Amino acid sequence: DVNECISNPCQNDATCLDQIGEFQCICMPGYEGVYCEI
Structure with a gap:
């Protein structure tokens, strides 16, 4: 079932979040x- 959230584009410790054409890493309020890694 997984395909895009298999490597985790994130850099620090963010999660995956993609539906069809909107990939974004979930991080902490401040990064x-x-x-999500700054």
């Missing part, structure tokens, strides 16, 4: 970046 910036494209994949």
